[PDB]
Design a protein around this nucleic acid. Structure first.
Lengths: 151, 64, 262, 205
RNA sequence: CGCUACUACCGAUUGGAUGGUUUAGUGAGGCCCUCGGAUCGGCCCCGCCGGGGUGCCCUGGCGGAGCGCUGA
RNA sequence: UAAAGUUGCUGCAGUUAAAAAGCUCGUAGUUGGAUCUCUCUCGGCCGAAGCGUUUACUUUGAAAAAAUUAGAGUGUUCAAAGCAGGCCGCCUGGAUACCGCAGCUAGGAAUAAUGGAAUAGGACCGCGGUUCUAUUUUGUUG
RNA sequence: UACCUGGUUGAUCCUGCCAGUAGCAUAUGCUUGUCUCAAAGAUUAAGCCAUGCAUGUCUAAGUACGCACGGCCGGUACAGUGAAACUGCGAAUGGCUCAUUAAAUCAGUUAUGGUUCCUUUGGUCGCUCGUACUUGGAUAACUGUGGUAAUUCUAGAGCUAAUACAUGCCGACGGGCGCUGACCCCCUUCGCGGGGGGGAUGCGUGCAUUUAUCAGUGGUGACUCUAGAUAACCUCGGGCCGAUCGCACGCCGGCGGCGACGACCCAUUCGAACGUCUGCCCUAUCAACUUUCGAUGGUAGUCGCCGUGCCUACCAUGGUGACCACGGGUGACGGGGAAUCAGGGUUCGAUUCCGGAGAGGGAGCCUGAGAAACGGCUACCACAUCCAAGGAAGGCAGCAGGCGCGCAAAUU
């Protein structure tokens, strides 16, 4: 679509799109191979990442983000930011005096690559730790599992 | 910082009830029978036996 | 703090140095060198606390500055020089060679070796990388860099270094069935055959090891040091062969030894 | 003498944070190198670890690459025409990374003429200046002539680049950071990137 | 209610002394930038005694009275 | 601090001693009935053999400073200590346990939560079907 | 040792508190023979400080014409010891204290594939095709002349060194490789449609830096990794490629052994820095907070050692909260730990170990690998020292010691 929405040109820094090609040797568009990498830890590169046109330098698959550290999960709580969502991690904290637990939660802002189209509120996301991407963001969505009630 | 060690330990325990006739009589009998200087010697031997009993009890709660 | 620290408190020193608590406030802070601060034995601890060749640090300095102490074939005059695992200490004046080898309690034993064994040392290769127009390079746990290693040598293998020339003369691969010592963790100083390596991508691989007496333990891969091909070590082992007796068997052995005298 | 700490900022919750220590030297920042276009002027900066940064205050010349032809040349920088960050940087003609500049096309024109034996950016009314028809034509044997003829099959240049060569100055993007390395290196704009930046420049002016 | 003692509270006694917080203005000092250029030094000119190079004044010792360059 | 079961998780009280909201609804919170006993490398004993929806729990195994605490040895003259020492050069110590919670790991599968197909958008599978892998089994796009 | 006792009534049984009881920690009172350990100006005042000391440093191996000592009277430069001074290194460790500080510090757990790293250790260091049998100018110390009341103030003049500061070359070195391309040979069809070569002048070559592009030696779970190739750049504030010192002595102009020191670069060590997950006291008489005085995210940049609203410009309108946000208080540094304790808990932790912070309060820096350093500097604020009134010099929460404060803490 309209990839060039910013004031600066948007492109994958590792893909050279200005190679000289003669006109008569054209099959489809002239030349635009798409850069992507397979992240480790058994995660599958989304098909939209391989055959997409979006430009996201913070994408785990087509961007400049290396996933290393903790692999966590959460439920999507808010999706009101650009390429960023807020997930909620619920857990039980043990108070030893009463030998009991209490519900606590942490809100975590994670980068959502546009390769995960159709991500709802309430479905599980597996996020991986990366370098600080902004003031509060340090995790990238690596997998999206749909909610149980989602048809 | 010093090259000194402050590991020190009190070797006895003072009884909870200071003026108890039966305990006073028992301790005085021990003092006289064994020629002890004061009640602290009785309390020291009592503390030794108490620690030994506590260790034995804690061992008796473990699997054989 | 600003900049690096230069002191080591005696109580913050590694416990395997077996330093007491009333000698002083400070422990000899190991100098920077081939081995890490907590995985080394400084020369002063070896020459004073283990060998009793000196009574004070002044006498350790007096010995070292006569150039009587060689570490890995080179004379060292630094009394806090960090000597670590597999390092060979040669005192030619007294004609004795030692190899710094862990005890089953996790301590560097005073393990005397023959002068023929003192010619070489085992080194666990820490990394392999290509640099300098295609030249392969190898880095060991001893922190020595070797150019042009054998193409079959990989990370976690063990090489044999001839101390006179410092080049690889043999190597054991990291394979199941090879003898290995443990150089860190709870099982430090134990010797056994590698049984299996469970791999955890993005985390620490765990290696399972079986003693010569049939006891099985496990460590992280970073704590495994291959010693010999098969179950035959390429170095001399201490009096305890890496078999960690339980406290009951230690008590029984001590009582049997005591009752045999008198 | 500015700072670069993250603890003077509000927390994620928006609450105020209390500084538990004064500014540290490693959190320091330095004034921006507003790299102008002019005769070369670079001030070396001593940085953490004892290393050196090259704070370019003035640069008139850079190293720019024609990517399709793989022709990298040293070239005078003429002007700053577009800045995606701040339009003011264009008004002050500041060289920063990713700013669009005009570079002299003469080195790339010279390489093209000496490589393809084809005129480029040359007005048809003119009949070449003295002492350059030789490098265009020369006296070559059959082998050299057939080599240049084989090169001629892949010598077509896109119309946008051709028009730029007619005007004598090319559009380029600065890809190095002049305030950190003292250099204004970059690449000539081509293809859809050139189309986008021409559209942006003409929309701005 | 009358006394006696003590304790908080209300409050313009338009009460006296320090503690901080902040609009407006001013702002030391350092650092950066753009200049500046007191001085100092090199190559040719009233330094021109002297060299393995003889009527080769051209030095490796003295304002060489130089809108002549040049570096600090 | 214990005594204080006078802060009560264990483990307190609320008719009259101090105390249950005037009464209902109601969100969050808390708590919730039964029920469900192959291995798309196969080679003439060895390995690419799978958190196999998941979690909580439980049992492991790693990894986790020392000192302190517990605790092993050791006649400091005894002891608090100390980490020493013992035998006519030699011999032996400087153990070990514990190290909540969270993180990692691996067995169990009761208990508890959760999931699987009802608009069939269902499991196994024979038969088809319209872009396209940059290795073709040995004179190289002859 | 899983413990209770006295007190309401005329008497009783209760609820219930008061008092008792034992430890612990500060103070204090009375008393005190031996001996071994051993805390000790935390609490109030991170209040103020007289004086003294607490950080300096030389090997055979940087620089010795100080007769300051000291010889073997000489083509014998330097015997040797050696103050001083230049150079190098350290002074960023240690010690003190707990004021600040409430997801901050800190602890465990991970990460740096997002960084810097003096030193140590190992490697690399004729891999660059372009005066050397050693280059230049200074400046200390020293001599001599001085100024000021005053300082670890320094100013002229006369010398003279380098491992200080600069400059800079034979050599390896024979050339190879890449891109050029005046010219020549052989074969097929005299449609050279094609090939194969030799090639003279020319440009550029190694490592590092910057940019663009290409191809897929080793490695990772995963690189936009490592290595390679190409086109070039290559910072006057210009980077590596040794103009250094000692010892032992040699060998038919040459070839050398053992070291010291120094310089890139890459590892290593010691770290530092910045992130991940979880965990912190009381308070609702604190319920909404933040929002370009960047608040949350996006794009581009700047700056920074690097990731990042760190900052800037545009864009979006976000982000946190009864699972207690935000605000407030703390006679709050966090932890390891301490006291007490049947089981469970309660309280404490200024205090010798680890981490943080600070040096009267703020702020800003220089040098350096490392400091926003205070036994470094600069300024302001408070206090304060000497003065000849012009100026100069300060920082005990270091060790003693003094004043003050106090219930409360030792030797100049």
């Amino acid at each position: 679509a309209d990839i060039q929405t910013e004031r600066a040109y948007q492109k994958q820094p590792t893909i050279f799109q200005n190679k000289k090609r003669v006109l008569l040797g054209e099959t489809g568009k002239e030349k635009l191979p798409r850069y992507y990498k397979n992240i480790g830890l058994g995660f599958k590169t989304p098909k939209e990442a391989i055959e997409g046109t979006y430009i996201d330098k913070k994408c785990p698959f087509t961007g400049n983000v290396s996933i290393r550290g903790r692999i966590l999960s959460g439920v999507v709580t808010k999706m009101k930011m650009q390429r960023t969502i807020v997930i909620r991690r619920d857990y039980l904290h043990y108070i030893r005096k009463y030998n009991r637990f209490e519900k606590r939660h942490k809100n975590m802002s994670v980068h959502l690559s546009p390769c995960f189209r159709d991500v709802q509120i309430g479905d599980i996301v597996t996020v991986g730790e990366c370098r600080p991407l902004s003031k509060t963001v340090r995790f990238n969505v690596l997998k999206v599992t749909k909610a149980a009630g989602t048809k | 910082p010093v090259a000194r060690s402050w590991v020190c330990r009190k070797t006895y325990v003072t009884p909870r009830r200071p003026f108890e006739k039966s305990r006073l009589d028992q301790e005085l009998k021990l003092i006289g029978e064994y020629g002890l200087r004061n009640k602290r010697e009785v309390w020291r031997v009592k503390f030794t036996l108490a620690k030994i009993r506590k260790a034995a009890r804690e061992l008796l709660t473990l699997d054989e | 703090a600003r900049g690096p620290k230069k002191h080591l408190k005696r109580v913050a020193a590694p416990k395997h140095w077996m330093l007491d608590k009333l000698t002083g406030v400070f422990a000899p802070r190991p100098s920077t060198g081939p081995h890490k601060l907590r995985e080394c034995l400084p020369l002063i601890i070896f020459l004073r606390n283990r060998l009793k060749y000196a009574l004070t640090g002044d006498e350790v300095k007096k010995i070292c500055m006569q150039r009587f102490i060689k570490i890995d074939g080179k004379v060292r005059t630094d009394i806090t020089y960090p000597a670590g695992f597999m390092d060979v200490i040669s005192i030619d004046k007294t004609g004795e060679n030692f190899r710094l080898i862990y005890d089953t309690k996790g301590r560097f034993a005073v393990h005397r070796i023959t002068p023929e064994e003192a010619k070489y040392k085992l080194c666990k290769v820490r990394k392999i990388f290509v640099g300098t127009k295609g030249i392969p390079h190898l880095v060991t746990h001893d922190a020595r860099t070797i150019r042009y290693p054998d193409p079959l040598i990989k990370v976690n293998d063990t090489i044999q270094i001839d101390l006179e020339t410092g080049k690889i003369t043999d190597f054991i691969k990291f394979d199941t069935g090879n003898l290995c010592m443990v150089t860190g963790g709870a099982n430090l100083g134990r010797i056994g055959v590698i049984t299996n390596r469970e791999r955890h991508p993005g985390s620490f691989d765990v290696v399972h090891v079986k003693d010569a007496n049939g006891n099985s333990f496990a460590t992280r891969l970073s704590n495994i040091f291959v010693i010999g091909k098969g179950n035959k070590p390429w170095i001399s082992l201490p009096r305890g062969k890496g078999i960690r007796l339980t406290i009951a068997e230690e008590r029984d052995k001590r009582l049997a030894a005591k009752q045999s005298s008198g | 003498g500015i700072s670069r700490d993250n603890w003077h900022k509000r927390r994620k919750t928006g609450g105020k944070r209390k500084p538990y220590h004064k500014k540290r030297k490693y959190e320091l920042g330095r004034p921006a190198a507003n790299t102008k276009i002019g005769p070369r002027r670079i001030h070396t900066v001593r940085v953490r670890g004892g290393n050196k940064k090259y704070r370019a205050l003035r640069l008139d010349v850079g190293n720019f690459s024609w990517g399709s032809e793989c022709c990298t040349r040293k070239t005078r920088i003429i002007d700053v025409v577009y800045n995606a960050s701040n339009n003011e940087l264009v008004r002050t003609k500041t060289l920063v990374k990713n700013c669009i500049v005009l570079i002299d096309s003469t080195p790339y024109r010279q390489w093209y003429e000496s490589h393809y034996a084809l005129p480029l950016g040359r007005k048809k009314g003119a009949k070449l200046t003295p002492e350059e028809e030789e490098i265009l034509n020369k006296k070559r044997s059959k082998k050299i002539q057939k080599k240049y003829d084989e090169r001629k099959k892949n010598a077509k240049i896109s119309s946008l680049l051709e028009e730029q060569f007619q005007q004598g100055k090319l559009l380029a993007c600065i890809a190095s950071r002049p305030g950190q390395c003292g250099r204004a290196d970059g690449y000539v704009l081509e293809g859809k990137e050139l189309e986008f930046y021409l559209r942006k420049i003409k929309a701005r002016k």
